[PDB]
Each structure stands twice: as structure tokens, then as C-alpha cells.
Amino acid sequence: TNIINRITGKTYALPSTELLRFYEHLEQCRKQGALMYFLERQGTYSGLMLDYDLKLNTNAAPSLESSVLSRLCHRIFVHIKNSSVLPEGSHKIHFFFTLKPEAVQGKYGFHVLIPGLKMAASTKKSIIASLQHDATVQKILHEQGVANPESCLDPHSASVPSLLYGSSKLNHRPYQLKTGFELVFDSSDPDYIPIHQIKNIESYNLVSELSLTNEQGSLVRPVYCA
Ligand SMILES: [Mn+2]
Ligand SMILES: [Mn+2]
């Protein structure tokens, strides 16, 4: 796991035990209001992040209710499963939605983090490309006021360095976690896909759990894809 401090320009490379202590520190710094610009490199095999760059019809943030976010989780999981990469059995994967604080001149954004589902970069690009054939996702975004529902998912989401939670550019404010969902898929019951909001998200180390390269989270336990 490699970390980039865009403020000090320095780079890092930590082990599991160290990372958690690294993330323990960063988490402390987060709950103290410190401004951070930490990025993690996705590498070639890690969690998935979807970066949505929204152009809006008005200058007000979309509502993005949990009912809508739950719908997007289902659609995103369909394209994940369609990549034919999930392992057999019953497994728990988590979706996290971090949102831009405010709409600025009609521009808005949100990130969908599935940090525990470790997969290859080629698999991520296939899912990202497949997610743009999805008329249901486009309609959902359209009903939210998004002016570019056909071109809002950044194709480089599979390779761009990913901001750690609480980090931002020296000019911008960091994205804020709105809610997170728990999805359970079972190869012995493929039609059953329960999606529910995670209980007590605030009780976890958010920097650690949402990390795409972390494998020692408490809530987010890794599920390795083919
Ligand atoms: Mn963005
Ligand atoms: Mn982008």
C-alpha cells in the first residue's frame, strides 16, 4: 500500500500493522478538523471506486435519498456480478457514498466506494464501461437533476489515485460520507440480493474501512475476485 501526501509531496509504503496505526493517526487528525491531502494508489488489484462528476440543471445539490442510493447499489452490483469474477459462497460487501459538500456553479459529485471487493484493474474498467450501458442508472440520475447522466462516470476511476477519506485538494473541501449499505450475495441463492444501510458506521475508523487497499478493516473484510 502506497500513500501520497500531496501537501508535503512525500510518498510512503506501509505494512498492515503500520497502515492501521497510520490510519489510526489520520482518523484522529480527521476528527480534529485537520486538512489532509492523502492519496492511495489503487495498483493493479484492489477495491473498486466509482467517481461521478455531475453537471446539474440547477445550483442545488441533488437529494440523493437513501432509497435512490440503495437502487444504485443494486444496479452497480449487477454489473459487478456480470464481470464473472465473484467467488462462490455467501459474502458481505459494503457500498459507501461520499458526497461533495455543496453544488458549485451547477457542478456536483459523489464517490461510490466498494473497498472490500478486491479485483483487478481490468475488471474495474469493464464494470465502469458496462455501467454506461445502464439505462436505469441514467434515468435515476436524470430524475435527480443531473444534466449529463450519460457521461458523468469518470472512465479513469479504475486507475486514478484515490483520496483517503477526509482528504481533499488544498483548494477544495473533502467529500462527506452520507451513508453506507450492506450487500450479501450467495451463489446458492443468486436471485436474493439484500441491501440494507450499515448499522453504526460512525463507530468505525472511516479512513481505514473506506480504504481501497486496506485488508485489515473491522467492518470491511476483503472478498477476493477471480
Ligand atoms: Mn470527481
Ligand atoms: Mn473525475
Author numbering: 47 to 272
Passage from the reporting paper:
The N-terminal AEP domain is responsible for the DNA polymerization activity, whereas the DNA unwinding activity is catalyzed by the central SF3 helicase domain. The middle PriCT2 and D5_N domains and the C-terminal Tail domain all contribute to the DNA unwinding activity of C962R. C962R preferentially works on forked DNA, and likely functions in Base-excision repair (BER) or other repair pathway in ASFV.
One AEP-Mn2+ binary complex was solved at atomic resolution, revealed the detailed coordination of Mn2+ ions. The A-site Mn2+ coordinates with the side chains of Asp97 and Asp99 and three water molecules. Two of the water molecules form hydrogen bonding (H-bond) interactions with His157 or Tyr221, whereas the third water molecule coordinates with the B-site Mn2+. Structural comparison revealed that the orientations of the two Mn2+ ions are similar in the binary and ternary complex structures; the root mean square deviation (RMSD) values between the two complex structures and the apo-AEP structure are around 0.6–1.0 Å. The Leu21-Val37 region folds into one helix (α2) in the apo-form AEP structure, but it is disordered in the binary and ternary structures of the AEP domain.
